[PDB]
Scaffold this active site. Structure first.
Site, PDB file in Angstrom:
ATOM      1  N   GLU A   1      26.686  29.274  23.581  1.00  0.00           N
ATOM      2  CA  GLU A   1      25.244  29.394  23.386  1.00  0.00           C
ATOM      3  C   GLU A   1      24.624  30.413  24.327  1.00  0.00           C
ATOM      4  OE1 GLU A   1      24.727  24.665  22.094  1.00  0.00           O
ATOM      5  OE2 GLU A   1      23.481  25.548  23.669  1.00  0.00           O
TER       6      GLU A   1
ATOM      7  N   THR B   1      43.964  49.468  40.235  1.00  0.00           N
ATOM      8  CA  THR B   1      44.598  48.370  39.516  1.00  0.00           C
ATOM      9  C   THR B   1      43.572  47.419  38.918  1.00  0.00           C
ATOM     10  OG1 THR B   1      46.140  46.512  39.705  1.00  0.00           O
ATOM     11  CG2 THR B   1      44.878  47.091  41.673  1.00  0.00           C
TER      12      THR B   1
ATOM     13  N   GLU C   1      49.879  45.135  44.104  1.00  0.00           N
ATOM     14  CA  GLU C   1      50.195  45.246  45.525  1.00  0.00           C
ATOM     15  C   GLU C   1      50.448  43.853  46.086  1.00  0.00           C
ATOM     16  OE1 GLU C   1      48.280  44.364  48.441  1.00  0.00           O
ATOM     17  OE2 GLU C   1      49.781  45.295  49.741  1.00  0.00           O
TER      18      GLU C   1
ATOM     19  N   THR D   1      32.995  52.310  49.904  1.00  0.00           N
ATOM     20  CA  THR D   1      34.217  52.249  50.699  1.00  0.00           C
ATOM     21  C   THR D   1      35.198  53.352  50.334  1.00  0.00           C
ATOM     22  OG1 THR D   1      33.940  49.854  50.890  1.00  0.00           O
ATOM     23  CG2 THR D   1      36.102  50.758  51.417  1.00  0.00           C
TER      24      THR D   1
HETATM   25  N1  GTP Z   1      32.441  41.472  46.761  1.00  0.00           N
HETATM   26  C1  GTP Z   1      33.634  41.878  47.181  1.00  0.00           C
HETATM   27  N2  GTP Z   1      34.072  43.150  46.886  1.00  0.00           N
HETATM   28  C2  GTP Z   1      35.285  43.574  47.315  1.00  0.00           C
HETATM   29  C3  GTP Z   1      36.100  42.730  48.047  1.00  0.00           C
HETATM   30  N3  GTP Z   1      37.234  43.392  48.338  1.00  0.00           N
HETATM   31  C4  GTP Z   1      37.161  44.632  47.803  1.00  0.00           C
HETATM   32  N4  GTP Z   1      35.954  44.765  47.172  1.00  0.00           N
HETATM   33  C5  GTP Z   1      35.471  45.953  46.448  1.00  0.00           C
HETATM   34  O1  GTP Z   1      36.527  46.523  45.701  1.00  0.00           O
HETATM   35  C6  GTP Z   1      36.442  47.935  45.711  1.00  0.00           C
HETATM   36  C7  GTP Z   1      37.828  48.566  45.645  1.00  0.00           C
HETATM   37  O2  GTP Z   1      38.690  47.796  44.841  1.00  0.00           O
HETATM   38  P1  GTP Z   1      39.649  46.697  45.519  1.00  0.00           P
HETATM   39  O3  GTP Z   1      39.425  45.340  44.894  1.00  0.00           O
HETATM   40  O4  GTP Z   1      39.397  46.644  47.005  1.00  0.00           O
HETATM   41  O5  GTP Z   1      41.145  47.209  45.246  1.00  0.00           O
HETATM   42  P2  GTP Z   1      41.822  46.993  43.807  1.00  0.00           P
HETATM   43  O6  GTP Z   1      40.796  46.528  42.800  1.00  0.00           O
HETATM   44  O7  GTP Z   1      42.941  45.997  43.932  1.00  0.00           O
HETATM   45  O8  GTP Z   1      42.402  48.435  43.392  1.00  0.00           O
HETATM   46  P3  GTP Z   1      43.567  49.135  44.255  1.00  0.00           P
HETATM   47  O9  GTP Z   1      42.928  49.975  45.327  1.00  0.00           O
HETATM   48  O10 GTP Z   1      44.391  50.015  43.352  1.00  0.00           O
HETATM   49  O11 GTP Z   1      44.453  48.090  44.893  1.00  0.00           O
HETATM   50  C8  GTP Z   1      35.722  48.291  46.998  1.00  0.00           C
HETATM   51  O12 GTP Z   1      34.793  49.322  46.762  1.00  0.00           O
HETATM   52  C9  GTP Z   1      35.004  47.027  47.421  1.00  0.00           C
HETATM   53  O13 GTP Z   1      33.612  47.204  47.316  1.00  0.00           O
HETATM   54  C10 GTP Z   1      35.666  41.446  48.347  1.00  0.00           C
HETATM   55  O14 GTP Z   1      36.378  40.691  48.998  1.00  0.00           O
HETATM   56  N5  GTP Z   1      34.430  41.021  47.913  1.00  0.00           N
HETATM   57 MG    MG Z   2      44.685  46.753  46.312  1.00  0.00          MG
END
Ligand code: GTP
Ligand code: MG
Ligand code: GTP
Ligand code: GDP
Ligand code: GDP
Ligand code: MG
Lengths: 430, 190, 430, 430, 430
Positions: free
Chosen positions: A245, A136, A62, A170
């Site tokens: 290690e 993704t 994306e 979420t």
């Molecule tokens: N710690 C932390 N977790 C995040 C953050 N952004 C998203 N997440 C976690 O990522 C989960 C969802 O995956 P995302 O990283 O948001 O989206 P993606 O991995 O790119 O997968 P897609 O939805 O297909 O785009 C959510 O449940 C959030 O808890 C962040 O900035 N910090």
């Molecule tokens: Mg995404």
């Protein structure tokens, strides 16, 4: 002559990569333009005259986050054609990013990995970051790990995955792809570190006294943990530790490599200097169950091995005098077949502060990486969440129609059952 | 080998004598080695009282009090200070006569025999178990896991080595085969 | 004549050597540029023991530095007196062992050792009359405890009549910095008994105890432990480099301190040691030296010497003093402690006098005693080893590189047999 | 030859020794750095009595300092002449006794005493010909009165033929600084009579009385009492370190002043003592010395010597003087006071002359008399003991550490028997 | 090598802890920031470079006072995470702070106590401060004492409790929790000192001539008393006293350990220098009934034992000459079974003055800790107050509904009756 390559995939992965890459550039004195106005070699490479290029690659299907990166202040730092971007998002569907759209992108990423690896001469290993509860992220992380495990073989790979919180979530479908990705990286990753958001929210609320945190505050703490882990490779220290290690000290058996981390001290400048921050009190705070970086209770299980890093002006005798006190306490008990379980590292460089951030400047800090038997609870609760919806086959049509077979869900369940049985079998005394 | 009845007893008595001779707290500075050798072959009054105390004879009755033993010691000791092995035997016989003095019907020989039974001298292990020090450490300015650790090594025993033994013969045969294969590789590459 | 070469391996051994060579150079008045600036004639007469001669009049140590990673030798070169070492003697690999004994002894250490053996052979074949070799390494690390011990066997196979020294640091259970310490300690002790002519155990716990109690300095560091170990190391060969009333080379100590060929594990100690504030109170006399020399807390090992009986003892006095006083004091320390000396070998204390004291001190003593109290260290090491091995914890790391459990069983059995037969003579009577 | 070693315990004993050794060093011309700077040849001939010889030509006292708390010895080291003491002889615990006799004699004093006995044995075995030991301690404290008296028995058990001196300060009821003084005084007197060859009682009340009345100085301090006690201590052994008309060692005094083995409690006094303003008025003559020597207020004890009859008396004159005058004056002091001398032993005064006077004085006298008037001190001590014991006050502190009331009853009975049999000879007639 | 840990719980405890911690920092020269611009070790600890950290912990359930502490000038001194704070106050309810909310906080306090104790090597004992007439203070003090009595055992604990005044009172329910807390600490504390506010108000009014005092003026006097008590551990003195040397001198029987204190002189700079402040007059003023620090009349009862500390340039002979005068007086009579009842301590360091305070600078001071039979009156009047409301069961529902049983009130009444009978039984002559 020692190098490491970090892989960032998904929105969460890219947003934590940004967080770690302000910190590294600040710690090595490199300006955001990449120009200095011999320790940099671990993360960077010299271009011959002037700028430095990070040994990192950003992946996402994306385009929004990459476009935000390519227009910020760090537009001049990263090489223009290592920020691989797609057109269509996987939309939280694991089967999409493993079977449909990730396959056409994975070849470019592997070509970039080869082009970065041929430059390194002393490659220690790989780092990878990915939020597990997304399409993704989990899918491409699984595919990249599976390709790397056969292209390179015995090179070490470390995974800083962010599992979903026990109750806070979420998405609504994240248990499915979390379980599938755990299946994929169980037999393919050497180290996996737990990073769920709820525990870090509680840490910020209790210590940093922030009542409205955002993702940046979480990512800065994660970046500090990464810097503490990798400090020993690029700074002089009385007791050094290398990445290779680890499987000899924290991993009793090939299947068991999920461990949870903690950091100390975490304190704001408004009340940091009123107390002395001795090594004993910080090493006590690091072992507090409420300061775990993952929402798990260590009092519910045994310890297997503890690897814990210091940095600053700490003296080894003070470290030993504090390990003895912890061995004394009756609320912390180790497994029977492990008489000594501590690996200690000492470094001289104090942690660096990021301007406008939350943490203050201190001379002593401790970061622990501990492997414990109590981690099985997160697997059990994720399994319970998965079973509820898999009983009625809900949301399965979104996965079967993306090329995945019907039986692929069951074997991940069987592997989780095997892992839970293994964790119970190991923790019983002889 | 064997010893006479008075001597087996004599051998065990000599062992006690030599033990208590070494317990003497010698007072003084810069001795000659001749004096040290002499003092290792004689018992003083303190070590003789220690012997009587450890064998539960001292202060048991009015005839074996600290003062009575001191008078007896000065009367029968060499140079009024020291007992050699022969004077130590004589002193034990005199103490036996004093200790059983109220038993009028016993001969002096039976009193000595009764004392030798009381100290259990005929049983070397029980007799030796009653020997107690005075004091030493080996000079070392002194002061949860203290409880002792009897590391019982696993018997690489007749049953256990057997496989391991068989394994050593196999490993030697494999090394001989590797040497022969290296020699045959050197011969076949030659 | 009768000179020895220096070989060190691992990080701990390199750090020990980095102070040992500084101490030797300061003793002989050699500047960090290799130029002699000494005051006394005797400072140059026997300089061929440790130093070679090159064109331009400068001196170069005959030391060989080996490690499986380049960081430690790249760091020791920038330290003081780091330029003395010949750049040709630096040999290193690009991978490291990761505290895994198998990797540093079977897979990686086997291929690299040819290059270091080449320079070792170059150094030994050339020298006037060989006396022997001295080895510094740690038993708590993988690459050190593997490559050093295999090099011991390789050297012994080619020079069976020369003498071999090893200064070995064994991992204590009190101050533990690595979780896999028992495995590579037990594996190393198996090979070390078969080939080393002399072995001297040193413990970090005892060094911290000494620094905290006798010197009473607030913040011990590795530099102080290294300095104490270096002073103890230099004290042994002092009379071989300087005249004295009764010269006694290493072979003479080997004859007089080893009753049976398998009992060659000594524990050492150095006197005098006084705090900065009390260095004016004390008066240096032979009684004051000998009372501190036999002190239990002064031993460089946590083993308690009044828990057993000395088989034999040795003392190497330094400075100009009367021999009659030394002999009478040795007799007195043996008459007042007859319970702690074995009785079937009379006159079991060896003494030697060297007329050249250490720089800054008027009298000094080095103590080397073979005692039965050393059994406790092997007992606890084997206890931890058998506690960890019964569950096959961390065993896959070792078994994935061609090693098997049979070599673990044989090592445990041989170590237990050594423990038993070492105490067999404690209960022996004449 | 015929030298003695110094052993002191407790705070009071340490403070007494801190001035005794200063007085001895000033007498022999030894600087606080241990370097001789004397004027006369005789100052070095018999220096082996109290001082040992070390390399570099400096001298070190053969003193042993022990206490259950480190404060007093950490304070005496910073005082003048504090550097002479060998640091090795300092032995101390980390807990203290808290003026509890049981803690300093059964629980804590028993475990520590092995280390101090080791150095005591080292000192005695080495010396040329032993004369004996002298002990300074206080009966008003717990750790002192316990550990010192147990050490007396331990020393007596190992050296039955040597002589033993004890300078004991008993708690007077006038100047009381501790409420539990009677208990540990009565317990200590029980053990002290059985083992000490000589005992010399000293009272703070008598020292204050002397300082206020004879010297007439406005503000007495512990330094003046210590100086008087030190002068009295030095006066006894003067003729053993210097030539004289009639030399008389300690054993000769033991023969002539103790009629029966249980009557060895003396009270002493020193002459001359004059105020600063009257030091020019007085003329030093033998009559002037002997009239002040037998003065009742001059005794170092509050006991009134004209309330009883002397069993025997001794005088140690110093300086060069005619013997005929000394003998005639001794006869005159015995003819004019026939009522206060027991009649069934004629000629009960011993005299000795030493030709070396104290530094700064031309004549001096030390008086040691065995009198029946000492019964009054034990009477009042036992009176307070039985007044406090009948209610079992403060008894639980002692009974909580393994002691019982039976040992209190036996101690009281033995002390009363001593009191009775000491006065038995007062009413005896020929 | 001697240490002590002070515990502050409740609003009154924290407000007196602040008062003592300005005084200690001022007396040892430490600035409020904790930086100096070997006596500190009793109360402080060295961090290696720079600041000192107090060996104190602050406890409270109500956050206002701790927040005030963490923002004042002393914000940098205390360690940030030893100021344990709750959320909900106990609101003067004893059952709350012993059964409901104190249990969840007590574990953190015990962890902090362990972390502070492992640092000390010569721990003398604990100090605790708590105002008795409050919920959280009394309840948490009881719970902490009960936990410490079993975690550590024989270590000494001292309690500076502030009982309510005879008629002046701030609450209406304080007799209930005062009686319950007296029950709790009767069998759990080694020393308890009386500190009611009315007596100190009268002292301020009469001597300091302040007509409108506040709590700070009271707390400064209490801080001065604490400093006088603990001066002997950190300053050189002619007659030292340790904390462990109390139950052997002031506590005749295990049940009787409540005593009342006094201090002298108390005078302002406006009229202090017009009079000489001799030792006799100050020791007379200290024994005046109107200068007792607790509102009790010593003329109504006997004395049992008096322990009284001096500091400054006082000479022991002047102290004895004043103890004699007090023994002479007919208005002060001691118990029959105690012939001598005085324990005297002398220190050299004069009391330090706090700028802007009430007391002036003087060279001599005296602090007495006296155990007397007259203390039973406060118990009798508190018992009478308790019975009036317990007859009708008033305010009991506020305690039964917080988990406490109905019968718990009666047994405290029985223990007070037993204590009053014991005090009468002890005071009768034999
Ligand atoms: N710690 C932390 N977790 C995040 C953050 N952004 C998203 N997440 C976690 O990522 C989960 C969802 O995956 P995302 O990283 O948001 O989206 P993606 O991995 O790119 O997968 P897609 O939805 O297909 O785009 C959510 O449940 C959030 O808890 C962040 O900035 N910090
Ligand atoms: Mg995404
Ligand atoms: N001497 C002295 N006494 C105080 C002070 N502050 C409060 N007190 C006493 O404490 C009693 C009540 O207890 P507090 O300390 O005020 O409150 P607490 O102990 O925290 O208990 P809670 O009411 O539950 O918070 C009152 O009767 C006061 O007499 C003070 O500053 N100095
Ligand atoms: N005396 C001393 N010991 C050290 C030093 N550095 C490390 N050690 C010890 O060496 C052990 C670790 O050995 P290691 O570095 O892994 O050896 P390697 O595997 O050969 O590199 C630790 O337990 C330390 O106690 C040093 O500078 N001085
Ligand atoms: N002469 C003298 N007597 C002292 C001195 N200090 C204390 N004392 C006496 O010693 C008694 C207390 O003994 P204490 O210190 O408790 O002995 P400890 O228990 O062995 O430490 C007091 O009654 C004092 O009279 C000193 O410096 N000189
Ligand atoms: Mg409150």
């Amino acid at each position: 002559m020692r190098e490491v390559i970090s892989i960032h995939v998904g929105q969460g992965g890219i947003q934590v990569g940004n967080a770690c890459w302000e910190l590294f550039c600040l710690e090595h004195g490199i300006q955001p333009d990449g120009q200095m106005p011999d320790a940099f070699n671990t993360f960077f490479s010299e271009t011959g005259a002037g700028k430095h290029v990070p040994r990192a690659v950003f992946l996402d299907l994306e385009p929004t986050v990459i476009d935000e990166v390519r227009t910020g202040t760090y537009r001049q730092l990263f090489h223009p054609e290592q920020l691989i971007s797609g057109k269509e998002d996987a939309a939280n569907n694991f089967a999409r990013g493993h079977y449909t759209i990730g396959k056409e992108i994975v070849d470019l990423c592997l070509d970039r990995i080869r082009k970065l690896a041929d430059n390194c001469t002393g490659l220690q290993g790989f780092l990878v970051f990915n939020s597990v509860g997304g399409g993704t992220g989990s899918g491409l992380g699984s595919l990249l790990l599976e390709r790397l495990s056969v292209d390179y073989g015995k090179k070490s790979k470390l995974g800083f995955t962010i599992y979903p919180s026990p109750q806070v979530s979420t998405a609504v479908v994240e248990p499915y792809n979390s379980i599938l990705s755990t299946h994929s990286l169980l037999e393919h990753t050497d180290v996996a570190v737990m990073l769920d958001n709820e525990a870090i929210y509680d840490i910020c609320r209790r210590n940093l006294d922030i009542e409205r945190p955002t993702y940046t505050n979480l990512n800065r703490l994660i970046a500090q943990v990464i810097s503490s882990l990798t400090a020993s490779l690029r700074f002089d220290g009385a007791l050094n530790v290398d990445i290779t290690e680890f499987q000899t000290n924290l991993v009793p058996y090939p299947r068991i490599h999920f461990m949870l981390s903690s950091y100390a001290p975490i304190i704001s400048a408004e009340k940091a200097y009123h107390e002395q921050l001795s090594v004993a009190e910080i090493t006590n705070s690091a072992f507090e169950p409420a300061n775990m970086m993952a929402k798990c209770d260590p009092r519910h299980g045994k310890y297997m091995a503890c690897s814990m890093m210091y940095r600053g002006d700490v003296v080894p005798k003070d470290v030993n005098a504090s390990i003895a006190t912890i061995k004394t306490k009756r609320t912390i008990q180790f497994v029977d077949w492990c008489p000594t379980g501590f690996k200690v590292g000492i470094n001289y460089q104090p942690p660096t502060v990021v301007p406008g951030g939350d943490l203050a400047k201190v001379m002593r800090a401790v970061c622990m990486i501990s492997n414990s038997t109590a981690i099985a609870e997160v697997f059990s609760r994720l399994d319970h969440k998965f079973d509820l919806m898999y009983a009625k086959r809900a949301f399965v049509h979104w996965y079967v129609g993306e090329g995945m077979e019907e039986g692929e869900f069951s074997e991940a369940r069987e592997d989780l059952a095997a892992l839970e049985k293994d964790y119970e079998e190991v923790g019983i005394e002889t | 080998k064997n010893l006479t009845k008075e001597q087996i007893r004599m051998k065990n008595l000599k062992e006690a004598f030599n033990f208590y001779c070494k317990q003497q707290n010698v007072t003084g500075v810069a001795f000659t080695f001749d004096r040290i050798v002499h003092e290792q072959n004689v018992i003083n009054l303190a070590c003789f009282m220690l012997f009587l105390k450890q064998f539960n004879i001292l202060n048991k009755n009015k005839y074996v009090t600290k003062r009575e033993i001191q008078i007896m010691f000065k009367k029968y000791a060499l140079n009024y200070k020291e007992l050699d092995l022969d004077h130590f035997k004589i002193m034990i016989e005199k103490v036996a006569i004093a200790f059983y003095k109220e038993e009028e019907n016993l001969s002096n020989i039976d009193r000595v025999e009764k004392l030798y039974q009381y100290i259990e001298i005929d049983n070397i292990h029980k007799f030796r178990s009653k020997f107690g020090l005075l004091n030493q450490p080996f000079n070392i300015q002194v002061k949860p896991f203290d409880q002792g650790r009897d590391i019982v090594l696993k018997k690489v025993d007749p049953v256990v080595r057997q496989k391991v033994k068989q394994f050593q013969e196999f490993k030697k045969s494999q090394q001989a085969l590797q040497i022969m294969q290296l020699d045959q590789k050197n011969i076949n590459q030659s | 004549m009768r000179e020895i070469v220096h070989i060190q391996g691992g990080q701990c051994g390199n750090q020990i050597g980095a102070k040992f060579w500084e101490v030797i150079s300061d003793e002989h008045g050699i500047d960090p540029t290799g130029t002699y600036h000494g005051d006394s004639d005797l400072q140059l007469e026997r300089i061929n023991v440790y130093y070679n001669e090159a064109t331009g009049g400068r001196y170069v140590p005959r030391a060989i530095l080996m490690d499986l990673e380049p960081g430690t030798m790249d760091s020791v070169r920038a330290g003081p007196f780091g330029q003395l070492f010949r750049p040709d003697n630096f040999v290193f690999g690009q991978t490291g062992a990761g505290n895994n004994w198998a990797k540093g002894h079977y897979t990686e250490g086997a291929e690299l050792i040819d290059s270091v053996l080449d320079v070792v052979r170059k150094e030994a074949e050339g020298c006037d009359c060989l006396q022997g070799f001295q080895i510094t390494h740690s038993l708590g690390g993988g690459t050190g405890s593997g490559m050093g011990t295999l090099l011991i066997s390789k050297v012994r196979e080619e020079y069976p009549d020369r003498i071999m020294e090893t200064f070995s640091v064994v991992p204590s259970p009190k101050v533990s910095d690595t979780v896999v310490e028992p495995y590579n300690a037990t594996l190393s002790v198996h090979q070390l008994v078969e080939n080393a002519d002399e072995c001297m155990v040193i413990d970090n716990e005892a060094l911290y105890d000494i620094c905290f109690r006798t010197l009473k300095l607030t913040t011990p560091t590795y530099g102080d432990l290294n300095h104490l170990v270096s002073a103890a190391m230099s004290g042994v060969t002092c009379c071989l480099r300087f005249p004295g009333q009764l010269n006694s080379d290493l072979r003479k100590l080997a004859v007089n301190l080893i009753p049976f060929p398998r009992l060659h594990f000594f524990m050492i100690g150095f006197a005098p040691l006084t705090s900065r504030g009390s260095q004016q109170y004390r008066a240096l006399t032979v009684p004051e030296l000998t009372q501190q020399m036999f002190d239990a807390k002064n031993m460089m090992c946590a083993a308690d010497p009044r828990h057993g009986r000395y088989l034999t003892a040795s003392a190497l006095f330094r400075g100009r003093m009367s021999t009659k006083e030394v002999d009478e004091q040795m007799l007195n320390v043996q008459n007042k402690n007859s319970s702690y000396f074995v009785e079937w070998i009379p006159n079991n204390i060896k003494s030697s006098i060297c007329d050249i004291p250490p720089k800054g001190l008027k009298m000094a003593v080095t103590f080397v005693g073979n005692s039965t109290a050393i059994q406790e260290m092997f007992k606890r090491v084997a206890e931890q080893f058998t506690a960890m091995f019964r569950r096959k914890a961390f065993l896959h790391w070792y078994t994935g590189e061609g090693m098997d459990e049979m070599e673990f069983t044989e090592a445990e059995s041989n170590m237990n047999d050594l423990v038993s037969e070492y105490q067999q003579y404690q209960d022996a009577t004449a």
